[PDB]
């Protein structure tokens, strides 16, 4: 931070050069910012997560993930419901 | 470069808003008014809110 800069330039992040096994020396993007810092960096609050940490919940991701589009980790949609109609299964044994 | 006739052909952004609103509740139709004069969004809302 530098609060002498005008609003918009008064906060910034220097991204890591490696995240989740990806080389980010040149390939950085906004999705690398984890949720606790995303709130501070977008000025949704004045309080950084160092002095104002978020609530701890057991189900919250411990490892942030950036945008994984067009990688083997990309999301692929699918129907989450099970089969509705059930076919009759013909007998295995013959009939004469 | 003298203009003898202007024939404006429109409908290239006709999206059938007015028909779609007939299938919406009054609250559901409100956001369609943001997207009319989408440079004066809240004024469009205000017109529809006053009418309702």
């Amino acid at each position: 931070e530098d609060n002498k800069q005008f609003f918009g330039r008064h906060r910034w992040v220097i991204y890591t050069t490696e995240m989740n096994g990806k080389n980010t020396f040149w390939d950085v993007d906004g999705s690398m910012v984890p949720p606790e810092w995303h709130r501070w960096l977008h000025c949704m609050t004045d309080d950084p997560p160092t002095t104002n940490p978020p609530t701890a919940r057991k189900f919250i991701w411990t490892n942030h993930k950036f945008n994984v589009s067009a990688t083997p980790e990309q999301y692929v949609p699918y129907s989450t419901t099970r089969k509705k109609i059930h076919e009759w299964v013909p007998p295995s044994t013959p009939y004469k | 470069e003298m203009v003898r006739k202007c024939d404006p052909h429109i409908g290239l952004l006709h999206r059938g808003t007015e028909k779609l609103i007939e299938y919406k509740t009054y609250l559901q139709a409100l956001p369609y008014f943001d997207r009319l004069d989408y440079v004066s969004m809240m004024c469009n809302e205000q017109a529809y809110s006053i009418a309702v």
Partner: protein, 157 residues
Amino acid sequence: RSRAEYVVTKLDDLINWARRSSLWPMTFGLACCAVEMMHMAAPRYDMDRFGVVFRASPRQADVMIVAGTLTNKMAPALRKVYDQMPEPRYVVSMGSCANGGGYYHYSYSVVRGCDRIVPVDIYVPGCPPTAEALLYGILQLQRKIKREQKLKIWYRR
């Protein structure tokens, strides 16, 4: 691999870098989404500092940003100007309307997603996506172009 393969790979990087660094979108915008595109060009985001410059001619454009709703009456014209861009060319679909019809998906007059008309490289969600969200998608297109391997694939043919 070999030194001929190494040289080919470095050439891919160079030509890829040139196209990354000088992306010229068409002056082409359809509805409210185009307003946020103006805000990406405006001073706060200043797309021109990344090398992104609007040109009105499809012959002088590299990217089409489909910024708004695509109607049936507009669809042939959009296809025409896409076809008249020289290659290599890219398409960015911007906003729910272009992405899949959005609020007007069920209309008699609307194309349910511009990817029924042109191939799409990046889909930017939102209604409208913010100027920043669009900028993020443009930077995602650049990284996609960074991954192109056309010369390596030519060498291995």
